[PDB]
Amino acid sequence: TSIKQLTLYTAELDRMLAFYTNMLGAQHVHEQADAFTIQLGVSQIQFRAAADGTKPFYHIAINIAANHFQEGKAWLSGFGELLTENDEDQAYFPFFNAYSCYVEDPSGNIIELISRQQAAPVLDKPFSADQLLSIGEINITTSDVEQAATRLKQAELPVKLDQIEPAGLNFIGDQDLFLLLGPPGRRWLFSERVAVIYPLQMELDNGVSLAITETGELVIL
């Protein structure tokens, strides 16, 4: 399955709109009075205003083609300084057989491009914003990992309940989409920001819709 729409919150709506309009182009962005949407291939994200006194952020990875990693990295670097971890400005993840690079948006969202070496197409054409494929990762930061995992499984996502670590990060998915399910508390790779519960909503292309509430409960809508 793929993410059809994600709804995220931001304390920086105006700066975010400018950032994504410049990055993706006006044809991939729609402004509303109280929100805006961006198109990432087959996935959409709506950003809405955060509650005053909060500064929500998320870990968002965007799938790019198997052969587009270095072009994607160069492109991404035009929009901010590439984030580094251990003084490296890219990463290889053997579990996903994937290369990743990262930049921060105006809210501190971790914007990752992920090039899955066997789980993405080879596209024989130049990379551009038009070649972003879909959302490949989103964090599901929850106050109850076991409950969340159980509800995701009841919703017919691939979940091996006996392997779930309630105090750790759990990769839930297959192919080109993984939910990063875990508790708050720990610093995110490539970021200064520590995992904190912020609300979101997610609609999958198979019709499944869910929310993370402001207290971190995963609820099936």
C-alpha positions in Angstrom: 0.0 0.0 0.0 1.0 3.7 -0.4 0.3 6.9 1.5 -2.4 8.8 -0.3 -2.5 11.7 2.2 -0.7 12.8 5.3 -1.9 15.6 7.5 0.9 17.3 9.6 1.0 20.3 11.8 3.5 23.2 11.7 4.2 26.4 13.7 5.7 27.9 10.6 3.0 27.8 8.0 4.1 30.9 6.0 7.8 30.0 5.9 6.8 26.4 5.1 4.7 27.5 2.2 7.5 29.5 0.7 10.0 26.7 1.2 7.9 24.1 -0.6 6.7 26.4 -3.3 10.4 27.1 -4.1 11.4 23.4 -3.8 8.6 21.7 -5.7 7.1 24.5 -7.8 3.7 26.1 -7.7 2.2 23.3 -9.7 2.8 20.9 -6.8 1.5 23.2 -4.1 -2.0 24.4 -3.2 -2.5 27.2 -0.6 -5.6 27.5 1.5 -6.6 30.0 4.2 -5.5 27.8 7.0 -3.3 25.1 5.4 -1.5 24.1 2.3 -0.9 20.9 0.4 2.1 19.5 -1.4 2.3 16.7 -4.0 5.0 14.1 -3.7 4.4 11.7 -6.5 1.4 9.6 -5.6 1.4 11.0 -2.0 0.1 14.3 -0.7 0.9 16.1 2.5 -1.4 18.8 4.0 0.3 21.1 6.5 -2.0 22.7 9.0 -1.4 25.3 11.8 0.0 23.8 15.0 -1.4 24.7 18.4 0.2 27.8 19.9 3.1 26.9 22.2 4.0 23.8 20.2 6.5 23.3 17.4 5.7 20.0 15.7 8.1 18.2 13.5 8.3 14.8 11.8 10.6 12.4 10.0 9.5 12.2 6.4 11.3 10.1 3.8 10.4 10.5 0.1 11.1 7.7 -2.3 13.2 8.4 -5.4 14.3 6.1 -8.2 17.1 3.5 -7.7 19.3 5.3 -10.1 18.6 8.9 -9.0 20.4 9.1 -5.7 23.3 11.4 -6.5 21.1 13.7 -8.6 18.5 13.7 -5.7 21.2 14.6 -3.2 22.6 17.4 -5.4 19.0 18.8 -5.9 18.2 18.6 -2.2 21.4 20.5 -1.3 20.0 23.5 -3.2 17.4 24.0 -0.6 19.5 23.8 2.6 22.7 22.5 4.0 22.6 18.7 3.9 22.3 17.2 7.4 25.2 15.1 8.6 25.6 12.2 11.0 29.2 11.2 12.0 30.3 13.8 9.5 28.8 12.0 6.6 26.2 13.8 4.4 24.6 10.5 3.2 23.8 7.1 4.7 23.5 3.5 3.4 21.0 1.3 5.2 21.7 -2.4 4.5 18.3 -3.5 5.8 16.5 -1.4 3.2 19.4 -1.6 0.7 18.9 2.1 0.3 20.9 5.3 0.2 19.6 8.4 2.0 20.3 12.1 2.3 18.6 14.7 4.4 17.7 18.4 4.8 15.8 20.3 7.5 12.7 22.4 6.5 11.6 25.6 8.3 9.8 23.6 11.1 12.7 21.2 11.7 11.1 18.4 9.8 13.7 15.8 8.8 13.2 15.7 5.0 14.9 12.6 3.7 15.3 11.3 0.1 15.6 7.6 0.1 16.8 5.7 -3.0 15.9 2.0 -2.6 18.4 0.1 -4.7 16.1 -2.8 -5.6 12.8 -1.7 -4.3 12.4 1.4 -6.5 12.3 1.7 -10.3 15.2 2.6 -12.6 14.0 5.7 -14.5 16.1 6.6 -17.5 15.6 10.3 -17.4 17.0 13.3 -15.5 15.9 13.7 -11.9 13.7 16.7 -10.9 10.9 17.6 -8.4 8.6 15.8 -10.9 10.4 12.5 -10.2 9.6 12.2 -6.5 7.7 9.0 -6.3 5.8 8.7 -3.0 6.3 9.0 0.8 8.6 6.1 1.8 8.8 6.7 5.6 6.8 8.5 8.3 7.3 8.3 12.0 4.5 7.0 14.2 5.6 8.3 17.6 3.2 6.9 20.1 2.5 6.6 23.9 1.7 2.9 23.5 3.7 1.0 20.9 2.1 -2.4 21.6 -1.4 -1.0 21.3 -0.4 0.9 18.1 1.2 -2.2 16.6 -1.9 -4.3 17.4 -4.2 -1.8 15.8 -2.0 -1.5 12.7 -2.1 -5.3 12.4 -5.9 -5.4 12.9 -6.0 -2.8 10.1 -4.2 -5.4 7.9 -0.7 -3.9 7.8 2.1 -6.4 7.9 3.0 -6.7 11.6 5.0 -9.3 13.5 3.7 -8.7 17.0 6.1 -11.0 18.7 9.1 -9.0 17.4 7.7 -5.6 18.5 10.0 -3.7 20.9 7.8 -1.4 23.0 10.8 0.8 24.0 12.4 0.9 20.6 11.9 1.8 17.0 10.0 -0.7 14.9 10.0 -0.8 11.1 6.4 -1.7 9.9 5.9 -2.2 6.2 7.4 -3.8 3.1 8.6 -2.9 -0.3 8.8 0.9 -0.5 6.8 2.1 2.5 7.7 1.8 6.2 6.1 3.3 9.3 8.7 4.1 12.0 6.8 3.1 15.1 8.3 3.9 18.4 8.1 5.9 21.7 9.2 9.5 22.2 12.5 10.4 23.9 15.5 9.6 21.7 17.4 11.9 19.3 16.6 11.3 15.6 19.5 10.3 13.3 20.7 13.3 11.3 18.9 15.8 13.6 19.3 17.6 16.9 15.6 17.0 17.6 14.4 14.3 20.0 11.4 12.2 19.2 8.3 13.9 20.7 4.6 13.0 20.2 2.8 15.4 17.8 -0.6 14.7 16.2 -1.0 13.5 12.6 -3.4 11.8 10.2 -2.7 9.3 7.5 -4.8 7.9 4.7 -3.5 4.9 2.8 -4.5 4.1 -0.8 -6.3 1.0 0.4 -8.8 3.1 2.3 -7.3 2.7 5.8 -7.2 6.0 7.7 -5.6 6.6 11.1 -4.6 9.4 13.5 -2.1 9.9 16.2 -3.8 12.0 18.8 -2.0 14.8 20.7 -1.3 12.3 23.6 0.1 9.7 21.2 -2.7 7.2 20.8 -2.9 5.5 17.4 -6.5 5.4 16.5 -8.0 3.8 13.4 -10.5 6.2 11.7 
